[PDB]
Amino acid sequence: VVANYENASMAADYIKRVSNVLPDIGIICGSGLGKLIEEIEERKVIPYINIPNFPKTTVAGHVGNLVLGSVGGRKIVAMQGRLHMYEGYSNQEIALPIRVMKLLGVRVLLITNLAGGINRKLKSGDFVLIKGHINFPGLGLNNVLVGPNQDEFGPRFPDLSNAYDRLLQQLALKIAQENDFQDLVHEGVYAFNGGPTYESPDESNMLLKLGCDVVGMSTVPEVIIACHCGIKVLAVSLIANNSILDAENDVSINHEKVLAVAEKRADLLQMWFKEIITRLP
Amino acid sequence: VVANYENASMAADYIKRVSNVLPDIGIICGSGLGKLIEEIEERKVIPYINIPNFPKTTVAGHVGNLVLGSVGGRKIVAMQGRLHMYEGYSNQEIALPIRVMKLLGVRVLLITNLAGGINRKLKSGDFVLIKGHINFPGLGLNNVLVGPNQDEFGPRFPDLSNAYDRLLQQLALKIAQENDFQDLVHEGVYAFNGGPTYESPDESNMLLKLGCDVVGMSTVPEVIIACHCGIKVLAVSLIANNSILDAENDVSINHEKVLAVAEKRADLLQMWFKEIITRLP
Amino acid sequence: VVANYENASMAADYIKRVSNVLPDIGIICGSGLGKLIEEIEERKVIPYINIPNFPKTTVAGHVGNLVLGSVGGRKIVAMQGRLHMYEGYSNQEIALPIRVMKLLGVRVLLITNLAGGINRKLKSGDFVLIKGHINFPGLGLNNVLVGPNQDEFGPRFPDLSNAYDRLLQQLALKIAQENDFQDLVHEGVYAFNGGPTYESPDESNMLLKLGCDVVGMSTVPEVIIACHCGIKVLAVSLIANNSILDAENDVSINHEKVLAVAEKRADLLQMWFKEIITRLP
Numbered sequence: 001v002v003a004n005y006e007n008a009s010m011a012a013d014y015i016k017r018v019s020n021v022l023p024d025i026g027i028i029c030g031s032g033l034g035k036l037i038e039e040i041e042e043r044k045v046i047p048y049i050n051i052p053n054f055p056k057t058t059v060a061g062h063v064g065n066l067v068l069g070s071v072g073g074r075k076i077v078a079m080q081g082r083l084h085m086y087e088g089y090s091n092q093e094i095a096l097p098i099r100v101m102k103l104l105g106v107r108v109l110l111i112t113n114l115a116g117g118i119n120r121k122l123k124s125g126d127f128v129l130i131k132g133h134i135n136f137p138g139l140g141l142n143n144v145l146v147g148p149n150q151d152e153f154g155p156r157f158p159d160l161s162n163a164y165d166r167l168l169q170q171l172a173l174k175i176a177q178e179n180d181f182q183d184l185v186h187e188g189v190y191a192f193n194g195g196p197t198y199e200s201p202d203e204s205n206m207l208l209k210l211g212c213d214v215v216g217m218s219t220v221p222e223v224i225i226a227c228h229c230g231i232k233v234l235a236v237s238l239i240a241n242n243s244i245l246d247a248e249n250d251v252s253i254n255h256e257k258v259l260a261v262a263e264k265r266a267d268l269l270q271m272w273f274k275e276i277i278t279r280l281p
Numbered sequence: 282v283v284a285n286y287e288n289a290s291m292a293a294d295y296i297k298r299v300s301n302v303l304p305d306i307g308i309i310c311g312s313g314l315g316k317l318i319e320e321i322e323e324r325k326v327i328p329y330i331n332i333p334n335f336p337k338t339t340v341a342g343h344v345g346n347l348v349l350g351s352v353g354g355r356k357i358v359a360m361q362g363r364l365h366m367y368e369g370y371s372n373q374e375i376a377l378p379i380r381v382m383k384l385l386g387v388r389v390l391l392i393t394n395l396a397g398g399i400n401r402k403l404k405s406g407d408f409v410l411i412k413g414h415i416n417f418p419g420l421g422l423n424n425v426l427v428g429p430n431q432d433e434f435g436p437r438f439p440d441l442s443n444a445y446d447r448l449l450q451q452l453a454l455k456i457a458q459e460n461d462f463q464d465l466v467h468e469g470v471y472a473f474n475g476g477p478t479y480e481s482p483d484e485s486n487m488l489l490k491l492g493c494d495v496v497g498m499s500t501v502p503e504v505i506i507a508c509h510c511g512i513k514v515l516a517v518s519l520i521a522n523n524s525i526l527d528a529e530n531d532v533s534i535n536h537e538k539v540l541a542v543a544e545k546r547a548d549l550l551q552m553w554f555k556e557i558i559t560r561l562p
Numbered sequence: 563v564v565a566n567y568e569n570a571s572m573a574a575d576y577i578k579r580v581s582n583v584l585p586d587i588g589i590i591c592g593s594g595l596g597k598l599i600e601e602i603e604e605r606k607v608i609p610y611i612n613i614p615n616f617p618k619t620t621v622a623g624h625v626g627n628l629v630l631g632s633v634g635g636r637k638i639v640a641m642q643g644r645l646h647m648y649e650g651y652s653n654q655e656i657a658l659p660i661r662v663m664k665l666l667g668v669r670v671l672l673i674t675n676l677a678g679g680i681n682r683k684l685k686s687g688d689f690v691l692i693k694g695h696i697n698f699p700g701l702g703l704n705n706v707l708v709g710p711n712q713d714e715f716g717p718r719f720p721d722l723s724n725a726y727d728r729l730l731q732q733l734a735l736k737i738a739q740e741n742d743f744q745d746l747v748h749e750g751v752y753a754f755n756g757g758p759t760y761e762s763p764d765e766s767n768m769l770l771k772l773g774c775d776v777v778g779m780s781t782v783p784e785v786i787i788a789c790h791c792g793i794k795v796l797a798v799s800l801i802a803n804n805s806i807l808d809a810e811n812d813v814s815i816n817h818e819k820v821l822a823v824a825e826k827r828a829d830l831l832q833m834w835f836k837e838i839i840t841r842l843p
């Protein structure tokens with residue numbers, strides 16, 4: 001199944017017939033960071049299995065739904081579940097849900113993820129507003145856009161210089177200042193490690209030399225598909241650990257430690273994103 | 282279809298029966314930079330669709346032909362059309378036309394492309410004689426030679442240290458000096474970005490740190506296939522923009538701006554390559 | 563064929579019925595560096611073609627066997643043949659033999675390879691104990707673990723910080739000191755170049771900037787599969803040449819030169835690994 005205009009249109013028509021919500025905001029939440037989706041008002045849950053042309057999501061298993069409703073008086077659509085490229089999904093499978101968001105009317109996409117810190121100023125539990133990226137898969141012929149271009153969505157050769165909207169970053173910071181947590185909020189450059197192995201100690205040292213502030217295994221594919229079709233993006237990393245300090249001290253990382261940091265910041269992040277949604281222009 | 286000896290031989294036999302030209306020079310011209318192909322004398326046009334085993338080129342659409350004839354008294358074969366890896370073509374599809382050139386008798390391959398400038402000395406409209414490369418796809422397991430080796434063409438483990446012939450670079454520069462445009466001509470290292478997104482501002486800054494002078498989305502696959510089978514190469518980049526200055530100033534790039542630079546230098550480049558062809562040893 | 567628990571179990575059951583050896587040590591030897599396999603005592607040779615689910619190894623051709631027996635009073639299993647990713651084998655094909663080693667009882671995996679030197683201190687004929695790596699394929703979405711996770715073997719997100727066991731490196735060095743060849747033995751970081759082209763001169767210069775000591779086209783995939791399932795690893799590179807000196811002097815490299823260095827060090831390496839095997843805890 002190709003992420004083309006006909007296939008996206010069939011999915012969008014189905015969603016419309018079922019939901020009667022026309023969203024202008026989309027959200028994708030990182031693992032352990034999805035409690036906001038549980039508080040959507042007047043919500044309608046649409047499983048991927050019912051949506052024409054959506055990818056199968058039961059080899060990896062676990063959840064896989066679209067949730068439409070209201071937050072802070074705004075009409076939104078949330079992606080629940082996980083579709084990451086380290087799982088073996090194709091370019092076309094990652095792109096189709098974002099292109100359907102476009103056809104439903106989405107103009108702004110908000111994303112959170114879990115990442116490792118590279119910059120020496122970053123502590124476990126800090127937040128990073130992403131201002132740019134280094135896309136190792138893209139440099140290496142695994143860009144999400146490799147394949148025929150789908151002209152109805154965007155151009156053959158997109159420019160990513162404004163992929164991360166500046167005014168959205170400024171609003172996120174303004175809210176942090178209003179609630180006395182700006183000391184936790186930084187800005188920086190996100191390195192995309194295809195994964196699923198964590199960055200090795202020597203890879204972390206390389207990323208420091210190359211000007212990266214954080215590293216993770218998601219987000220950049222969705223950002224590129226959104227930018228290609230004219231959707232504005234805000235992306236925020238939660239820092240699980242500092243990989244440079246861990247390399248210098250011979251300290252390990254694991255998914256359990258990552259999930260405990262997610263639990264420690266889950267309430268703060270949910271409240272922050274609810275306020276961002278409410279105040280978006 | 283594999284780029285093997287039998288499949289290449291069948292294509293070569295067809296071309297011979299149709300053309301009665303045995304070329305010793307091949308040319309591949311960048312987008313907007315192909316007017317030279319229109320001035321080939323006594324020309325014969327052979328569409329890919331008629332050549333046994335050649336790849337299909339109608340999903341991307343647009344042109345796709347081989348043109349054989351004379352330029353400056355020399356027998357040449359030109360590739361018209363575009364076969365780039367960001368479009369989804371396989372290793373075997375990119376390699377087959379170059380291996381057919383080898384079987385027809387080609388000893389020298391001349392290539393032009395459009396690229397972004399990384400070195401601070403480079404201005405829009407300048408030319409770069411490529412003296413080496415950094416192949417991000419190759420480091421990352423997407424080299425054009427991944428797969429079984431085709432022993433009739435070359436070795437399992439090729440050396441690329443002489444991929445860009447030094448005497449051909451010197452002749453290109455000599456002609457520039459003779460015609461008072463040497464101030465536009467530089468030498469440098471080409472970074473291969475698989476594409477199709479332009480390099481991000483932070484990727485451009487990384488490439489500066491790593492010793493790259495220019496960046497583009499083509500050329501390196503063809504260079505590697507040519508070097509593997511003993512064909513000498515000259516490759517020249519036309520600089521569309523300086524990506525480091527654009528990153529520092531928050532300035533965008535698009536395919537339209539790139540094509541306007543191609544128009545501004547098209548006549549000069551056509552005249553330069555005609556003289557290179559005439560004077561090749 | 564997927565490298566899953568059922569398929570690995572069927573292969574392991576076959577091997578057991580044929581061999582009556584339960585090995586706790588596995589070995590993978592680099593090209594020209596396999597004479598040790600010829601001295602295995604009470605050996606049983608099991609060709610891949612007879613083992614349920616093992617990959618086909620006749621396109622590349624040449625040898626392909628498992629050899630079980632005793633060395634220095636220890637029970638071992640050796641992989642004879644070559645399964646490298648530049649040949650076009652899939653993630654699942656590389657991983658299956660290592661996962662079968664796990665099911666047979668292997669706890670330690672010993673690996674040798676041929677590599678190019680980047681650090682200026684390295685001479686042709688030196689040895690490097692690998693202490694970490696930079697995995698360009700992994701950063702670029704070609705990690706050996708891309709795909710569904712096989713939960714019986716290991717976790718979705720492995721940590722590689724202890725992939726290269728420190729005590730095994732210390733034992734290898736102790737034996738070198740006991741036999742007056744420690745002047746040949748270094749430690750360092752291994753860069754994985756997917757291949758099959760040797761690193762270009764400008765790629766070599768980049769790797770120097772990024773903190774790499776050696777570069778090669780193997781080893782990292784097997785290390786990652788072993789680490790994922792709890793097998794300890796020692797990996798040693800034999801240096802064929804110094805690629806930084808060769809770049810500065812305009813000197814070429816070829817597979818013939820590499821194989822002559824392998825011949826020059828083959829006896830020393832065979833004797834070293836026999837003593838390592840004998841003395842493993």
Ligand SMILES: CCCCc1ccc(C(=O)O)nc1
Nearest residue numbers: 047048049055056057058064
């Ligand atoms: C009774 C139908 C529900 C079972 C089901 C749910 C989800 C998926 C999928 O997302 O791939 N497949 C099947």
Ligand SMILES: CCCCc1ccc(C(=O)O)nc1
Nearest residue numbers: 328329330336337338339345
């Ligand atoms: C009447 C036959 C010409 C139509 C045609 C031309 C080119 C191609 C191709 O290059 O894939 N396919 C079909």
Ligand SMILES: CCCCc1ccc(C(=O)O)nc1
Nearest residue numbers: 609610611617618619620626
């Ligand atoms: C008579 C059977 C032996 C011939 C044979 C040997 C090895 C392989 C392989 O490893 O793919 N295939 C076939």
